[PDB]
Design a protein around this ligand. Structure first.
Ligand SMILES: Nc1nc2c(ncn2CCCCC(F)(F)P(=O)(O)O)c(=O)[nH]1
Ligand SMILES: Nc1nc2c(ncn2CCCCC(F)(F)P(=O)(O)O)c(=O)[nH]1
Ligand SMILES: Nc1nc2c(ncn2CCCCC(F)(F)P(=O)(O)O)c(=O)[nH]1
Ligand SMILES: [Mg+2]
Ligand SMILES: [Mg+2]
Ligand SMILES: [Mg+2]
Ligand SMILES: [Zn+2]
Ligand SMILES: [Zn+2]
Ligand SMILES: [Zn+2]
Lengths: 261, 261, 261
């Protein structure tokens, strides 16, 4: 049961509003290996998660201006595999909503299931498969809070098309030799890596990349009306048979200018 | 852990037996949009769930005679997405068993995965896929109570063939232009609606319709020996690619006469 | 949340080390119908689970020498369907590690999904599919204990190849008419048996046999560095459409001699 009341989000949000003059419209959640993205922020202000009332423990929240856009960034995220229920993993997203954030950018490291993928590739997330969600492990599980969103939110249009279009055209302006990949991200609980049988299984379900986060954050963001778009850094080609983080940082930085104000 | 002792079911059952002279042999569980089915009951008696000891909160239980058959009807059901564990969602089924009920009729609103389905269609449930059940979210999870059923109940014959046969022949007597659909119902936790990738995934698993209930009720009913049959009201054709409630009420009403006594 | 501290495993392990002179290098986990495997032990010593501090309740642990190899055997195992979280189901594996065990042999009764399987067949487990694991129901869920293993353990090489090779050559020396089967074991929560739609679904995921255990034990064993190999006794051919325990005991006994010392 969600151990957070509506007021808890509000308290946390007002705490942040009074401790920084920063008023972000964009929020970015970074997983593992994308910490250099926070060093590009100007007029930056960092808050350790441990100093923010109600924030899940263990990692920091960095406010600042990235390529002209005011944003708030999660340096380190939460995972189901660490033991947190999704209502803790996604706590920050609802706080962002209360801060006035309108767009959420999600990033993650993932295993490439699509044969055509190569290490270091950047896959624009066009869709996702939420396996934990099939069994009820859903961040929206429990009473619905109308002040956030509706009881039965649609997820088919989760990854904003306009931003995905900007992403492609922006990538083209970067003059990259490798095309910007695009595909379906499947989330699994973890923490162990998949077996061959499971890897094949996932590929046949239509997934292009596999990871252990993001989906719950996206679901909660869509529920509370945030515009969403994200990317997966293919850190390794998953083996289907028996026997670049810097570029992503630059890319997300450039996209700020393409996000509608 | 099932927060109900065997005695809790018994207490609830005797409470109901002493508050109504009605002695139902058939139980009907209605989801959303099938409330007019309760208005067809004669010599009806309603109990709000809140006045019945032990009943899960938030909705009423209506006793009465439907087309000559004495039955008990759930107007409003419980869902995993609301936060209830399956032992609460399925609490009523075991109570029905203790009331002397022999047949359970389940109904639900569902999304059509089968391309040949049309809005308003009525799909006789021939089989189901219990996704939450694959991860252990099972209403039978925990110590087995032999006074109800066996430890490892078979589910392959869950939807009574004889009733499915009656359903088809009865539908034919109704002179309906649209054929009575038949297929596999897949249950997901919810509450968000599926993405395109998930919708395709489900269709490839062999599911004809998708919903957020019923399966746990059917499993518990089969476990305690109840005869089962049900229907899905296809309220919308699910989109598989990127870019009638009154009739059901009449149908279930007519089928009472086909249920063996 | 894992209700066991590192010290709990240690306490249990030292308790056993001081109550028997036996110092096993191999551990065997037996499910249902493989109890005669314990009667082949010499210089045997039995401990009821109920007399071992910290051991999950309801079944015994038998130490002894099997075909020249000192081993510890679980006669009766734990299942998710009984209500235990995986940290209780897999408690013994970590204890074995602390006892100095290096190899874990897992056995189970399973339903045959592969059409070519026959009742009584013995399927060497080459790989597995962990459905509960896709939703987070993972024995490794929670903080990682480095004294056991790494945060993100690989599972693709879970079933030791060398032992699988020994298994085949050993089976050939047995002069059995039926070949030693080999395949992928898929674990589901249970306790109900699958429907036709689910059975087909599982087969299409690439599973050869279906059961309700083993996978969590294997995962924890691999996490703490144990060599693993196992077998599934096909007790029945699963019906895919709508309408030997003694040999296994002998086989596992013979394989002791093939396990590296
Ligand atoms: N399931 C799975 N996950 C893989 C794989 N490779 C990398 N990750 C990513 C590891 C987790 C990444 C993260 F969760 F930490 P994140 O926060 O960066 O998303 C893989 O093969 N399978
Ligand atoms: N998963 C899923 N469910 C869908 C869909 N359309 C209607 N429902 C039914 C909504 C829930 C119905 C109910 F649970 F409330 P019930 O009680 O009527 O079954 C769909 O596309 N996907
Ligand atoms: N899911 C599933 N399991 C089946 C089937 N047949 C036997 N078991 C094995 C029954 C459980 C075995 C056990 F868990 F008790 P174990 O300890 O022997 O592994 C089947 O068709 N489906
Ligand atoms: Mg704190
Ligand atoms: Mg009450
Ligand atoms: Mg004890
Ligand atoms: Zn202050
Ligand atoms: Zn009274
Ligand atoms: Zn003693």
């Amino acid at each position: 049961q969600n151990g957070y009341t509506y007021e808890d989000y509000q308290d946390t949000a007002k705490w942040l509003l009074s401790h920084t003059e920063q008023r972000p419209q964009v929020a970015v959640i970074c997983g593992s290996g994308l910490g250099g993205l926070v060093n590009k922020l100007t007029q930056a202000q960092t808050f350790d998660y441990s100093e923010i009332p109600n924030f899940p423990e263990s990692g920091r929240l960095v406010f600042g201006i990235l390529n002209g856009r005011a944003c708030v960034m999660m340096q380190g995220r939460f995972h189901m595999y660490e033991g947190y229920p999704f209502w803790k993993v996604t706590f920050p997203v609802r706080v962002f909503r209360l801060l006035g954030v309108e767009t959420l950018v999600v990033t993650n490291a993932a295993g490439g299931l699509n044969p055509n993928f190569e290490v270091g590739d950047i896959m624009l997330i066009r869709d996702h498969i939420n396996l934990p969600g099939f069994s009820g492990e859903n961040p929206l599980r429990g009473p619905n809070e109308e002040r956030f969103g509706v009881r039965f939110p649609a997820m088919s249009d989760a990854y904003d098309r306009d931003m995905r279009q900007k992403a492609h055209s922006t990538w083209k302006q970067m003059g990259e030799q490798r095309e910007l990949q695009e595909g379906t991200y499947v989330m699994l609980g973890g923490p162990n890596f998949e077996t061959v049988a499971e890897c094949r299984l996932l590929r046949n379900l239509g997934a292009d990349a596999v990871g252990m986060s993001t989906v719950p954050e996206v679901i909660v963001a869509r529920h509370c009306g945030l515009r969403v778009f994200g990317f997966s850094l293919i850190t390794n080609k998953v083996i289907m048979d028996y026997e670049a983080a810097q570029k992503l940082e630059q890319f997300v930085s450039l996209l700020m200018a393409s996000i509608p104000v």
